Amino acid sequence: GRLNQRNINELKIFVEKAKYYSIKLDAIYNECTGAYNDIMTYSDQSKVNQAISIFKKDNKIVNKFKELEKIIEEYKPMFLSKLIDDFAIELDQAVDNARHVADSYKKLRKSVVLAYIESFDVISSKFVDSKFVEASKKFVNKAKEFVEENDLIALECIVKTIGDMVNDREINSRSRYNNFYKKEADFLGAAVELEGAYKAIKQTL
């Protein structure tokens, strides 16, 4: 009982603390999208420099990734802090001396999404209830497959379903994208099995 209540509370605490993880990552994508496209496209020396300047400006973008890193500080994967600094360093050399900056940005974003899943994986691995542990492995697998198809959409669905589960709201298994993403529906079905296993833990407390 002590262990299960601790398990539940740990998860609930993480989820609530990270409830803006998807909104905030979307905010980064929206601000950098015009700059990303111009680097990828005009790699025109002027436009490439102005795109670079928008990424670097006031170290704001890097600081937004550092903020996401901090939200999951207790669980974050060991590589994350490094990818962030590696991106900062590359951006700084491009300012001083550009497709590699944009590619590094994209890699980082996906790794930020995988870091939320990694955090959830760590926490769920502590659970003493074996059916929850199993449903969690299946969830994680389906989540990574959805991320390979689209990292920001995957993260948004992951954050929403897990949030719903921990606030006692029924998961919706109907596609919110008209079934355009091939991996959405299997992910939602795994979240429904996870919810059922989590329900069972909850209503024995």
TrEMBL record:
Keywords noted in UniProt: Metal-binding, Plasmid, Signal, Zinc
Signal listed as a keyword: yes
Family matches, as Pfam families: CRASP-2 (PF22487)
Residues given in the record as Mg(2+) binding sites: 90, 93, 100
Cited PROSITE patterns: PROKAR_LIPOPROTEIN (PS51257)
InterPro entries per UniProt: CRASP-2-like (IPR054523)
Domain of life from the UniProt record: Bacteria
Gene Ontology MF: a single term: metal ion binding
Protein name, UniProt field: Complement regulator-acquiring surface protein 2 (CRASP-2)
Organism phylogeny: Bacteria, Pseudomonadati, Spirochaetota, Spirochaetia, Spirochaetales
Gene assigned in the entry: cspZ
